[PDB]
Amino acid sequence: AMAAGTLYTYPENWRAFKALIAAQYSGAQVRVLSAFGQTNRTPEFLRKFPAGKVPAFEGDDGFCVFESNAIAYYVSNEELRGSTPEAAAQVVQWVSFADSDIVPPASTWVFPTLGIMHHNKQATENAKEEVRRILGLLDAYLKTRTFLVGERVTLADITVVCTLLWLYKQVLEPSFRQAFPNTNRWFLTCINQPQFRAVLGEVKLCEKMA
């Protein structure tokens, strides 16, 4: 029925969160091994997961999958994946949108506040505008919708929320996010679902920009 196995990741990984939240919905029993570290470079690990990335998943039956969206799909159910081809296409749509459109300019803006990057006041400011564009797109879409696909939470909302997680926490201060009330309503609703909450915990929106 539902998947059962081990999820290797570093602690508080927003990419692992996608698969952990989905499992809360599905009932998949996913074990987390985090405390590890640079174990991703061990030979065994490499065989199982040649990419050397995390997160990585090893089922109790020996089945291995090594990319975040794929782990989340695997431990999901039909409802999250999309019960119809239309709904499933729409899930892929938002997941791919999250990966291609949100991840990079969020990285460019956030890593500097985290210091993971190097701040180029032009790039960082362009990333801001990019994010603003994204928030705006979500806002206009969610004007008539409670969730992204159908009338229930799917891998779409789970993937996008986790991808926007760091922005909302560290950088999207109130003055900045007020232009997008529908995205914020959606974001708050999602992270307050019991399933999201068991993984994310209480999520404090950025009071002041970092």
Binding site: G150, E151, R185
Partner: protein, 87 residues
């Protein structure tokens, strides 16, 4: 209360109330949603975006309405607090 949920001004209060909300009470559907829903009776105009959005969402739950948690209250107990309230 929202006032008369079958009047425009009441739907405008319901709409403004739903701007930052997905449900009448909390972050999951409840009996609170069912009661206001049955009082609205028909899809709010699209210009009341938050009201209509919420309507279509609860409508998707109608086949399992009685299974929704919580207990029905007087319509006046929902939404914004009434300054003059009994009980």
């Amino acid at each position: 209360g929202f006032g008369d949920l079958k009047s425009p001004a009441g739907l405008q209060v319901l709409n403004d109330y739903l701007a930052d909300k997905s449900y009448i009470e909390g972050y999951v559907p409840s009996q609170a949603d069912v009661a206001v829903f049955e009082a609205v009776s028909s899809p709010p105009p699209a210009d009341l975006c938050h009201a209509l959005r919420w309507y279509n969402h609860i409508k998707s739950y109608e086949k399992e309405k009685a299974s929704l948690p919580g207990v029905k209250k007087a319509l006046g107990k929902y939404g914004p607090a009434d300054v003059e309230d009994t009980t």
